From Swiss-Prot:
Name this protein carries in UniProt: Rubrerythrin
Keywords associated with the record: Cytoplasm, Electron transport, Iron, Metal-binding, Transport, Zinc
Residues reported to bind Fe(3+) 2: 52, 93, 127, 130
Cofactor requirements of the protein: Fe(3+)
Length: 190
């Protein structure tokens, strides 16, 4: 059935507005992560931003046209150091999967928009992992574990793929000569 005049219709636009802002914020934080010398974290912000773009698109496609007024609160700024940015992003993700989406889904179901409710719930799942990544990375920075670990492990240069074995990432990649900032823990998800 139609969405016109429903609360869900307005909830969809409100989410779209918030997701759109998060996309920009994450891309800016990514640029800052690059300046602070954290390449992996920078690309995570950029990818998260791209995923926000997709969450927004799914929501956008439900809308039926015309202008709609919304009343909502959003973060007015700001861009700080990468650790602080990761913390603020995690807070944003948290509000989204614990408060906004669950509420929007419940209301969607209440008004008879089951498919939409399912999407709200599904998106929330993606946001929870987003928060997890942000929180884990913020913790790695706080504990000085981004480029150094307790036991010897494998480090991979994101720029050229060189693999380094040791307790910490090298100051310079011996293959491409790029700085330590480009290294991450060698990952295998397949
Ligand atoms: Fe997210
Ligand atoms: Fe390299
Ligand atoms: Zn999202």
């Amino acid at each position: 059935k139609s969405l016109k005049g429903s609360r869900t219709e307005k909830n969809i636009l409100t989410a779209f507005a918030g997701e759109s802002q998060a996309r920009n914020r994450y891309n800016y934080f990514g640029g800052q992560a690059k300046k602070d010398g954290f390449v992996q974290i920078s690309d995570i912000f950029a990818e998260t931003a791209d995923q926000e773009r997709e969450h927004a698109k799914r929501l956008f496609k439900f809308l039926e046209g015309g202008d709609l007024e919304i009343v909502a609160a959003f973060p007015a700024g700001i861009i700080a150091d990468t650790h602080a940015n990761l913390i603020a992003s995690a807070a944003g993700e948290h509000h989204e999967y614990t408060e906004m989406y669950p509420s929007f889904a419940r209301i969607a179901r209440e008004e008879g928009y089951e498919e939409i409710a399912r999407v709200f719930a599904s998106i929330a799942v993606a946001e929870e992992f987003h928060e997890k990544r942000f929180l884990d990375f913020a913790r790695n920075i706080k504990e000085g574990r981004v480029f150094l670990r307790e036991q010897a492990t494998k480090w991979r240069c994101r720029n050229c793929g060189y693999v380094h074995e040791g307790t910490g990432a090298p100051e310079l990649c011996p293959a491409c000569a790029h700085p330590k900032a480009h290294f991450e823990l060698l990952g295998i998800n397949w």
